[PDB]
Amino acid sequence: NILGITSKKIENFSDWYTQVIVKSELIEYYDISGCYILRPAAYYIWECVQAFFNKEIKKLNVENSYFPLFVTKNKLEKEKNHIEGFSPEVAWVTKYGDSNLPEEIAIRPTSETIMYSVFPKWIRSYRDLPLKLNQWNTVVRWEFKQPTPFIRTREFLWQEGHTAHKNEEEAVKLVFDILDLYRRWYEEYLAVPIIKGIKSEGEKFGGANFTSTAEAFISENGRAIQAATSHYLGTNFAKMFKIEFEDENEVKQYVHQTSWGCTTRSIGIMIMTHGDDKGLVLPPNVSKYKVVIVPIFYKTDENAIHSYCKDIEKILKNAQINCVYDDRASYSPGYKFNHWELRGIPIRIEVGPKDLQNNSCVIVRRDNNEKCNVKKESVLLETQQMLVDIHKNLFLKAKKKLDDSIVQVTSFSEVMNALNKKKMVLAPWCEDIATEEEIKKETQRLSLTNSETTLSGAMKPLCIPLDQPPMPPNMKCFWSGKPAKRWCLFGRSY
Ligand SMILES: O=C(NC1Cc2ccccc2C1)c1nccnc1NC(=O)N1CCCCC1
Ligand code: PRO
């Protein structure tokens, strides 16, 4: 009990989350606010999705690279909308030892300015295009909002991809190709559904022509959260960094650029999605151990149980299924059950005397706790199919919750009702940037219906979904009363 999760996910989501990430050994806290340690179980997930994304961006001819952590004032300030957005959260190095630096230098919050400072040397003619680069690194955004492990941190691990193209068409195609890879990263590895859409003008990346986005939704507190992003930068950074190329007709042109990122926030979204009141729940593709084997003794005798459990370990490891046999003498079976449930292991296999006598074992799924007796010779196949089935169940259950978290409305008088039911709204909107602040202020004012002390009551535009319902001929904007343009998702958010 004391060693389990002692806050229910529905009753105290914030304390449940803290208990889950600590007791599963994902996260350790640190003496600098907003910075957290990724312990091995958390870093293993990152390596899994790193492996997947590398393999896929390789097919698009993107190549990994590594650029400096630091940027000079001269470079950092070249693109005005970019730096106006980041400048209050940029951390500056000013000293080495007790000596002042001759010039202060900034830590990257993102690397457009760093990388594009040298793109002009690499891109001189149409022969040099497309240029396609990625980095796996961390960046620093020194905000003073309340941090949350994985999802809102001052330093975070991510990849940032950056490409440059001879025209708009090719760059935009890559934007949406990357956006579908983020859909796959979340779906095939984290069993998380996302919504693709376009950011409103007030929410797009600074310096972007447009920002496409993958949005996730945390049903338990009614909060949307950006899962990944892929920007068409157009020629906006090419203008400011003078990234020009001579085209086939001997005319100077600006490159058309993209950048796109996805972070360890994805792990936090997975935890909040599938985690339950027993702790972490891992999709098998991001769990080091797919199976834990637990022995049960009453009280060859003890050697007979040990030999049998080791046989099952050999069967799984010979088939490339990593597993652990928990043969620790000092802890009860029920201790071990909780121990590994807490840590999110997908499958427990139990072996006691009655299972040995029947030449079977008990196979227990972490997601729904269903138990079944499997003969020894069918354990390999049953385990294989059950790992597939757990992932499918986690994803389908999550997708039903996401679907159920959207209410389509036509007037603002329906909005507050749905927000306080922890929903997002899909609403007809004129898309005028001026209305975004107005909507944020008024929904925050009317929220006077929240028990979160560190997240805003404001609802903001989340994304204009790529999948649009019909817009009836005279539908008005739900806020301004002007002709509505498209349907947009709004909600409270992280
Ligand atoms: O934005 C993050 N942190 C900042 C916001 C915040 C709030 C409280 C305290 C400190 C900070 C700094 C963030 N933190 C951790 C992991 N991913 C994060 N970001 C993202 O997932 N996205 C989407 C993909 C492109 C980049 C942004
Ligand atoms: O920070 C962002 O959103 C973009 C995409 C990764 C590179 N910079």
Q: For residues 107 and 341, give the distance between their C-alpha atoms in angstroms, rounded to a whole number.
A: 40
Q: Are strands 252-254 and 244-246 parallel, antiparallel or unpaired?
A: antiparallel
Separation of CA 260 and ligand 2 centre (Å): 5
Query: Given ligand 2 and candidates 139, 259, 262, which is best to mutate, with the most ligand atoms within 8 Å of its CB?
Result: 259
* Distances in whole angstroms, Cα of residue 491 to Cα of each of 223, 228, 406: 7, 17, 9
Alpha-carbon distance of 466 to 259, in angstroms, equals 19
Cα(439)–Cα(422) distance, rounded to whole angstroms? 17
DSSP string, 186-241: IIIIT----EEEE--TTTSPTT-SEEEEEEEEETTTTEEEEEEEEEEEETHHHHHH
Q: Collapse the DSSP code of 181 into the 3-class scheme (helix H, G, I; strand E, B; otherwise coil) and give the result.
A: helix
As beta bridge partners, residue 360 has 375
Cα 236 to ligand 2 centroid, rounded to whole Å: 14
Q: Residue 282 is which amino acid?
A: L
Q: For the packed helices 265-274 and 40-59, what is the interaxial angle rounded to 10 degrees?
A: 110
Contact predicate 164/119, CB 8 Å:
yes
Residue 201 to residue 438: CA distance in whole angstroms: 14
Pocket around ligand 1 at a 6 A CB cut-off: 34, 141, 143, 145, 147, 151-154, 156, 226, 228-229, 261-265
Structure determined by: X-ray
Quote the ligand 1 centre to 152 CA distance (angstroms). Answer: 5
Judge whether 459 and 486 are in contact, CB under 8 Å. Answer: no
Ligand-binding site membership of 458 (annotated): no
The number of residues making up the chain comes to 494
CA dihedral of residues 475, 477, 482, 483 (deg, nearest 10): -40
Q: Which of 278, 265, 227, 281 is nearest to 397 (CA)?
A: 281
Burial class (CB in 10 A: 0-12, 13-18, 19+), 95: exposed
CB 301 within 8 A of CB 339: no
Concatenating the DSSP letter of every residue in 208-223 gives -SEEEEEEEEETTTTE
CB 483 within 8 A of CB 463: no
Q: Which atom of ligand 1 is nearest to the CA of 228?
A: 24
Write the DSSP symbol of residue 209.
S
Distance CA 144, CA 162 (A): 28
- Residue 259 Cβ inside 6 Å of ligand 2? The answer reads yes
CA-wise closest residue to 256 among 243, 266, 271: 243
Q: What residues are paired with 214 via a beta bridge?
A: 196, 228
Cβ 229 under 6 angstroms from ligand 2: yes
Pocket test for ligand 2, best of 90, 160, 203, 225 (most atoms within 8 A of CB): 160
Query: Is 383 assigned a ligand-binding role in the annotation?
Result: no
Domain spans of the chain, in order of start = 1-283, 284-388, 406-493
**370 class by beta-carbon count within 10 Å (0-12 exposed, 13-18 middle, 19+ buried):** exposed
Closest CA to 258 of 169, 382, 321: 169
If you search the block for the tokens 């889950």, which residue do you land on? 20
Task: Indicate which residue's Cα is closest to atom 26 of ligand 1.
Answer: 261
CA atoms within 13 A on the CB side of 129: 25
What phi and psi, each to the nearest 5 degrees, are found at residue 24? Answer: -80, 0
